[PDB]
DNA sequence: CCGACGGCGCATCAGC
DNA sequence: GCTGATGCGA
DNA sequence: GTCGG
């Protein structure tokens, strides 16, 4: 909140470039600048001072000076008035509707929540669910509720097979007071980078959670990733809790550390760390950290026994989860 | 100046 | 049916 | 839009 005005402006500019301009790199550039400014420990006084931060160039510097002076950004004033842009922006807020589909719908005259509801037939499954719980998905999740959800998931997973280990990551693991959703990393000894000694490992868990009515809907479901909806049980006379998005990722047990690092985030932190890895001659994904030969092709997986091991390979001091919220 | 910018899972599609 | 490309998402 | 070579 120290430089809230400027970061909000940058984030809005970022969303515009992504949803309307479909210029993903401009999107990341803005988000990075927004992130770097967000942790700057001083109340920014000028674009010049801001340009000293990495990721902030001449363009954002000018925009910051404009914002600091007037208290707004004309470029944004306009974007906010353009009915097409605003419509595209809105629709992309429905889970399942990206920049392409949004532009396509608007070109069909479908540009509001009301239009989407009467044209439900024109939506694929994911979009149908995103629209159904549109309101709820906008709501944040108090950490207290996250704790209750964790308890339900861990206990139900334990019931399926005591050998399962379920770890809630995402912003929760980073210590956030509230989260946009629940992200669950799941492991089981019967599934490693060496073999899949038992099939349906993820299925069984998803099934158990549906059986006790915690999981209510499914957006997508594969062998290692589940994307759906859940809801905490409410007491008698108590109004129901909002429905929530839940992601579950089954990762090879022998690759837990690269897995938990990836799933802990943040997303911008992962980008920056993976970008730093490249500059150091390494490539990192949710399974391994591999070296890059002179040729450029990824080499063999390096031995990892802790999140810190990954940080060492790239010559970075270890950072606790609470300090990776970029 | 200009090429890189993180990496991948699932759903859906076109082309065979 | 397969692969590969795309959209959308983590 | 920003960066580094
Ligand atoms: N583009 C991305 C997106 C995600 N992630 C990893 C790193 C992320 O931490 C993790 C979770 O994705 P999430 O989509 O639940 C998230 F990011 F919003 P979270 O941090 O959990 O914040 P919230 O509370 O609001 O959910 O996936 C990533 O690596 N790249
Ligand atoms: Cl771009
Ligand atoms: Cl503004
Ligand atoms: Cl690992
Ligand atoms: Cl790999
Ligand atoms: Mg999350
Ligand atoms: Mg998530
Ligand atoms: Na800079
Ligand atoms: Na969307």
Closest CA to A321 of A282, A254, A265, A268: A265
What are the angstrom distances between the C-alpha of A110 and each of A50, A178, A215?
40, 33, 30
The answer on A208 and A95 residing in a single domain is no
Nucleotides of strand D lying closer than 7 angstroms to a protein CB: 1-4
Most ligand 1 atoms within 8 A of CB, residue of A170, A220, A248, A258 to mutate: A170
Structure determined by: X-ray
What are the angstrom distances between the C-alpha of A199 and each of A46, A77, A190, A202, A204?
58, 54, 9, 8, 9
Q: State which residue has its Cα closest to the C1' atom of C6.
A: A100
The answer on A268 and A255 residing in a single domain is no
Tokens of A18: 């992504």
Q: How far is the CA of A158 from the C1' of B2 (A)?
A: 54
Q: Cβ distance A281 to A271 under 8 Å?
A: no
User: Among the atoms of ligand 1, which is closest to the Cα of residue A141?
Assistant: 24
Phi/psi of residue A270, nearest 5 degrees: -65, -40
CA A127-A180-A216 angle, 5° bins = 50
Full residue range of the structural domain in which residue A228 is found: 140-262
CATH number for position A294: 3.30.210.10
N-to-C CA span, chain A: 14
The answer on A107 and A191 residing in a single domain is no
Tokens of A23: 């210029």
- Which of A262, A293, A311 delimits the end of a domain? A262
The answer on A298 and A242 residing in a single domain is no
Q: Cβ distance A131 to A123 under 8 Å?
A: yes
Catalytic residue among A18, A32, A63, A132: A63
Q: Tell me how far the alpha carbon of residue A263 lies from the centroid of ligand 1, in angstroms.
A: 7
**Burial (Cβ within 10 Å: 0-12, 13-18, ≥19) of residue A109:** exposed
3-state secondary structure of A141: strand
The answer on A135 and A97 residing in a single domain is yes
Closest CA to A19 of A104, A81, A78: A104
Spatial separation of the C-alpha atoms in residues A137 and A130, rounded to whole Å: 8
CA A227-A133-A155 angle, 5° bins = 50
Q: Which residues contact A216 (CB under 8 A, 6 or more apart)?
A: A210, A228, A229, A230, A231, A243
- Annotated active-site residue A63? The verdict is yes
The answer on A147 and A133 residing in a single domain is no
Q: Which residues line ligand 1 (CB under 6 A)?
A: A 170-171, 179-181, 183, 247, 262-267, 270
3-state secondary structure of A217: strand
The answer on A193 and A177 residing in a single domain is yes
Q: How far is the CA of A49 from the C1' of C1 (A)?
A: 60
**Full 3-state SS string of A220-255:** EECCCEEEEEECCCCCCCCCCCCCEEEEEEECCHHH
Spatial separation of the C-alpha atoms in residues A149 and A281, rounded to whole Å: 40
Spatial separation of the C-alpha atoms in residues A163 and A205, rounded to whole Å: 12
Phi/psi of residue A302, nearest 5 degrees: -85, 150
CATH number for position A107: 1.10.150.20
Q: Cβ distance A255 to A302 under 8 Å?
A: no
Q: Tell me how far the alpha carbon of residue A267 lies from the centroid of ligand 6, in angstroms.
A: 10
What pairing do the DSSP bridges indicate for beta strands A165-168 and A182-187? antiparallel
Count: domains in chain A: 4
Closest CA to A219 of A127, A137, A140, A131: A127
- The ligand that comes nearest to the alpha carbon of residue A64 is 3
The answer on A157 and A128 residing in a single domain is no
CATH number for position A61: 1.10.150.110
Tokens of A304: 């990892």
Residues with CB under 5 A from ligand 9 (ion): A 92, 97
The answer on A96 and A49 residing in a single domain is no
Closest CA to A244 of A145, A102, A96, A119: A145
**Burial (Cβ within 10 Å: 0-12, 13-18, ≥19) of residue A128:** middle
Q: Take atom 7 of ligand 1 and give the residue whose Cα is closest.
A: A265
The answer on A185 and A215 residing in a single domain is yes
Structure-token match 């925009």, residue found = A63
Residues with CB under 5 A from ligand 7 (ion): A 181, 183, 247
Spatial separation of the C-alpha atoms in residues A259 and A82, rounded to whole Å: 42
Q: How far is the CA of A235 from the C1' of B6 (A)?
A: 44
Residues 59-88 of chain A with CB under 7 A from strand B are none
Return the exposure string of A5-15: e unless at least 16 CB atoms fall within 10 Å of the residue's CB, then b: ebbebbbbbbb
Longest dimension (CA), chain A: 66
Residues with CB under 5 A from ligand 6 (ion): A 170, 181, 183
Q: Take atom 8 of ligand 1 and give the residue whose Cα is closest.
A: A265
Helix axes A58-70, A4-19, angle to 10 degrees: 130
Spatial separation of the C-alpha atoms in residues A120 and A137, rounded to whole Å: 18
Cα A85 to chain centroid, rounded: 23
The answer on A145 and A257 residing in a single domain is yes
User: Among the atoms of ligand 1, which is closest to the Cα of residue A270?
Assistant: 29
- Which of A82, A97, A115 delimits the end of a domain? A82
The answer on A156 and A244 residing in a single domain is yes
């Amino acid at each position: 909140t120290l430089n809230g005005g400027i970061t909000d402006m940058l984030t809005e500019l970022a969303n515009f470039e992504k949803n309307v301009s479909q210029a993903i790199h401009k999107y990341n550039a803005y988000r990075k600048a927004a992130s770097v400014i967000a942790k700057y420990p001083h109340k920014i006084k000028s674009g010049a001072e801001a340009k000293k931060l990495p990721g902030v160039g001449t363009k954002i510097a000018e925009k910051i000076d404009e914002f600091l002076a007037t208290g707004k950004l004309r470029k944004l004033e306009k974007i906010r008035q353009d009915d097409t842009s605003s419509s595209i922006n809105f629709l992309t807020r429905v889970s399942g509707i990206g920049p392409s589909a949004a532009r396509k719908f608007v070109d069909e005259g479908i540009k509001t929540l009301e239009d989407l509801r009467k044209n439900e037939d024109k939506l694929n499954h994911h979009q149908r669910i995103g629209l159904k719980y549109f309101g709820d998905f906008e709501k944040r999740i108090p950490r207290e509720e996250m704790l209750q959800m964790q308890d339900i998931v861990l206990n139900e997973v334990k019931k399926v097979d005591s050998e399962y280990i379920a770890t809630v990551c995402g912003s929760f693991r980073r210590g956030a007071e509230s989260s946009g959703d629940m992200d669950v990393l799941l492991t089981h000894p019967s599934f490693t980078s060496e073999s899949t000694k038992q099939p349906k490992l993820l299925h069984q868990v998803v099934e158990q959670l549906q059986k006790v009515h915690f999981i209510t809907d499914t957006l997508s479901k594969g062998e290692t990733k589940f994307m759906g909806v859940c809801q905490l049980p409410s007491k008698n006379d108590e109004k129901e809790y909002p429905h929530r998005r839940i992601d579950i990722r089954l990762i090879p047990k022998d690759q837990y550390y690269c897995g938990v690092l990836y799933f802990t985030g943040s997303d911008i932190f992962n980008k920056n760390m993976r970008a730093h890895a490249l500059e150091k001659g390494f490539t990192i994904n949710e399974y391994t950290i591999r070296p890059l030969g002179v040729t450029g092709v990824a080499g063999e997986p390096l031995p990892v026994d802790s999140e810190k091991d990954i940080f060492d390979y790239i010559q970075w001091k270890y950072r606790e989860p609470k300090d990776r919220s970029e």
